[PDB]
Amino acid sequence: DCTMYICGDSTECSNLLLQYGSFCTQLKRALTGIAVEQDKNTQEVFAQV
């Protein structure tokens, strides 16, 4: 979670972080690809019958 980890629990956190653009939503789109893949690996090894 980018907002809470970086400077969470601060009213001046989000607005200052907001002007940096689309950084943590870029990272968030990379740690969900890993999450989905780790479920597909088990579907190809054990689920062949």
Partner: protein, 48 residues
């Protein structure tokens, strides 16, 4: 929330993620030490 997280007006079937769950503070509180040390002002105001 999902619509504005995906920055679109149309979404497809499946599980997504959005902003997080949080609890706002109920109030605000501050800290005080114990009693006060005595300064010699009674003697000054009651000096003979």
């Amino acid at each position: 929330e999902t619509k504005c997280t995906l920055k679109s007006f149309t979404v497809e079937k499946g599980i997504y993620q959005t902003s997080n769950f949080r609890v706002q503070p109920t109030e605000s509180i501050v800290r005080f030490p114990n009693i006060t040390n005595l300064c010699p002002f009674d003697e000054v105001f009651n000096a003979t």
